[PDB]
Amino acid sequence: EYHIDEEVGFALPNPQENLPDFYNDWMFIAKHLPDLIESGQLRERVEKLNMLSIDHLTDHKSQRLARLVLGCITMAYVWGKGHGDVRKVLPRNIAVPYCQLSKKLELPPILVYADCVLANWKKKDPNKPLTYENMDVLFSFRDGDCSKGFFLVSLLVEIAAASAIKVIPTVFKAMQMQERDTLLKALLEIASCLEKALQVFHQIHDHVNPKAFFSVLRIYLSGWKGNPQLSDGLVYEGFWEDPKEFAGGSAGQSSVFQCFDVLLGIQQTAGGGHAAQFLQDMRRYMPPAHRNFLCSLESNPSVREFVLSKGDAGLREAYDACVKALVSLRSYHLQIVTKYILIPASQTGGTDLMNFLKTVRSTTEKSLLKE
Numbered sequence: 001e002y003h004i005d006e007e008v009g010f011a012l013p014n015p016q017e018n019l020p021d022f023y024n025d026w027m028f029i030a031k032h033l034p035d036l037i038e039s040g041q042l043r044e045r046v047e048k049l050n051m052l053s054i055d056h057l058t059d060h061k062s063q064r065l066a067r068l069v070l071g072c073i074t075m076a077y078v079w080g081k082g083h084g085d086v087r088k089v090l091p092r093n094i095a096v097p098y099c100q101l102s103k104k105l106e107l108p109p110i111l112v113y114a115d116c117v118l119a120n121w122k123k124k125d126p127n128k129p130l131t132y133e134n135m136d137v138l139f140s141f142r143d144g145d146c147s148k149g150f151f152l153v154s155l156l157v158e159i160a161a162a163s164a165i166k167v168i169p170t171v172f173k174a175m176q177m178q179e180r181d182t183l184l185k186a187l188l189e190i191a192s193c194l195e196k197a198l199q200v201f202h203q204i205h206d207h208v209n210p211k212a213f214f215s216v217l218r219i220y221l222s223g224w225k226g227n228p229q230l231s232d233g234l235v236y237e238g239f240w241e242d243p244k245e246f247a248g249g250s251a252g253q254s255s256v257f258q259c260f261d262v263l264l265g266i267q268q269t270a271g272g273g274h275a276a277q278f279l280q281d282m283r284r285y286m287p288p289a290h291r292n293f294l295c296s297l298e299s300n301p302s303v304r305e306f307v308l309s310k311g312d313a314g315l316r317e318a319y320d321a322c323v324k325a326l327v328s329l330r331s332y333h334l335q336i337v338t339k340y341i342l343i344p345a346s347q348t349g350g351t352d353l354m355n356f357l358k359t360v361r362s363t364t365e366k367s368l369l370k371e
């Protein structure tokens with residue numbers, strides 16, 4: 001109901017690799033994107049396609065793979081080589097079934113995190129763990145874009161967080177059942193696991209190149225929203241009378257950080273300003289199952305308030321453990337941004353970026369009880 005696996009959390013537990021046959025037109029373009037962009041015969045092959053009706057997609061894992069395919073195609077079509085040459089008009093052939101499918105899942109008709117990370121992976125040998133070496137994506141855009149690195153390390157962090165997320169019910173039960181000792185354990189447990197997920201985060205150095213990321217992959221993950229290059233938007237010819245602007249799919253559409261902001265009663269989405277508004281806006285780009293879950297956390301009693309009520313340094317400590325773990329993650333994520341965007345982009349937009357993240361970080365910092 002909340003679509004949260006015990007093992008991989010927000011991620012898609014075991015995603016469909018193969019579409020039905022009726023959608024083989026789709027799978028070839030998508031399967032082979034490194035070549036059709038680098039040759040030039042993507043936009044022409046997308047130009048003349050069959051408006052393949054959506055009805056023949058039975059179950060979920062199908063519909064999600066379809067979004068991934070359709071979406072990967074739409075990024076590749078609209079941006080092309082990604083050298084300042086842009087397609088403002090998306091065909092009636094690709095747009096109408098993608099816009100429909102996207103209405104089925106209540107996701108935007110754009111590549112989002114749910115698609116290009118959560119739904120976009122595979123174990124190579126299914127008896128071997130979920131580790132970088134024994135995993136791979138289903139789709140890239142170009143070669144040496146380091147799509148594997150970005151998508152998988154993202155995914156791996158999702159999975160690290162699954163171990164924390166599955167504790168959450170214990171937290172709310174313990175609170176209701178008035179079981180202090182449990183609640184304390186569960187909170188420390190959560191902090192412990194969010195600390196793991198930091199180590200996991202270290203891998204982004206190993207498996208992604210700054211110059212390669214910023215240049216190649218960053219372009220294909222960008223969206224029409226607040227886009228000089230598509231200021232008016234992208235026209236979904238057939239479906240929408242007008243062009244509709246939708247933001248690109250980052251890990252800022254991840255539920256993980258938001259999940260724990262909410263659990264720990266960190267009022268990020270309170271106040272005006274980009275910081276809150278952005279975070280709030282991003283929930284749209286999450287699956288509705290996952291939106292529901294964050295809404296449910298909010299509805300439950302405040303862990304923060306409970307902890308403060310009790311006058312119990314034990315709880316306070318464990319609470320702060322979680323909060324510190326979350327700050328640490330955001331603190332490290334900042335260093336990543338420096339390395340992978342700031343420095344590249346130089347070989348006050350970059351200052352705006354950093355101030356968004358630092359507000360969010362600071363907001364998270366301020367929820368500490370010792371400080």
Ligand code: HEM
Pocket residue numbers: 150153154155157158204208213250251252253254257258330333336337340341353357360361
């Ligand atoms: C090279 C790797 C990465 C880069 C360059 C990067 C860059 C950014 C940037 C520029 C933003 C600001 C919003 C936006 O532009 O979309 C952002 C936000 C965000 N990123 Fe990343 N990111 C990276 C990896 C990750 C990973 C692996 C995660 C989680 C697994 C993550 C989680 C987030 C979250 C949750 C936000 C929203 C702000 C927040 O809640 O703190 N990022 N990232």
